[PDB]
Design a protein around this ligand. Structure first.
Ligand SMILES: COc1ccc(-c2snnc2-c2cc(Cl)c(O)cc2O)cc1OC
Length: 207
């Protein structure tokens, strides 16, 4: 009930570079993922203009951020358009990077991943493992997942349903746990993402 796929070569290269780099400016991953969530929300919102049954799976258009120190995960949840099994494998599996890859001339990364369509992968600046959970109106709920190393998996999600949208779960590296800190997140969002056109809500952890 689980399929394994290979990353297109250019993507695996890019990932290996990100995973390893000592790049300082790691917080930019948060801007890339919020930026992707914002695009997905634009998509569903604009589709709903001509066909409001679109929103039947959820009217709220927002972005949630969820630190979990017991699990050492940070989750970004949106209720944008979401991805069918096929968008999921295309979008996360293939490329584009060449641009970027050849962009860091003879060097190691830059805050320009975003302007290059591959900003998602910057998640690997801070995470040893990413899981992507996604619900498009047309399809079932799927879980994508990869610890890098050239392959990802795709299966049908068994967990709580989402109605619609995308959920990006980062399993944080041992020494990047500052992004589970309420203070650091607020600061990061304010710096890189406050002019995003949807509510971004930080969930504070309970005692
Ligand atoms: C163009 O840029 C794109 C941006 C978003 C997506 C998609 S569609 N459904 N979800 C997202 C999305 C994807 C990711 Cl990775 C994420 O972190 C959050 C999400 O809501 C597709 C894009 O390209 C088809």
């Amino acid at each position: 009930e689980v399929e394994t796929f290979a990353f297109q070569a250019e993507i695996a290269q890019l990932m290996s570079l990100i995973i390893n780099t000592f790049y300082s400016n790691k917080e930019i991953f948060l801007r890339e993922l919020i930026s992707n969530s914002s695009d997905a929300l634009d998509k569903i919102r604009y589709e709903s203009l001509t066909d409001p049954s679109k929103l039947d799976s959820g009217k709220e258009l927002h972005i949630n951020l969820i630190p979990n120190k017991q699990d050492r995960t940070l989750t970004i949840v949106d209720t944008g358009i979401g991805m069918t099994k096929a968008d999921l494998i295309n979008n996360l599996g293939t490329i584009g990077t060449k641009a970027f890859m050849e962009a860091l001339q003879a060097g190691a990364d830059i805050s320009m991943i975003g302007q290059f369509g591959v900003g998602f992968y910057s998640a690997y600046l801070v995470a040893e493992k990413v899981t992507v959970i996604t619900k498009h109106n047309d399809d079932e709920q799927y879980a994508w997942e990869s610890s890098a190393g050239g392959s990802f998996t795709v299966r049908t999600d068994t967990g709580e349903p989402m109605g619609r949208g995308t959920k990006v779960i980062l399993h944080l590296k041992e020494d990047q746990t500052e992004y589970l800190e309420e203070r650091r997140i607020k600061e990061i969002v304010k710096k890189h993402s406050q002019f995003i056109g949807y509510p971004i809500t930080l969930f504070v952890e309970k005692e």
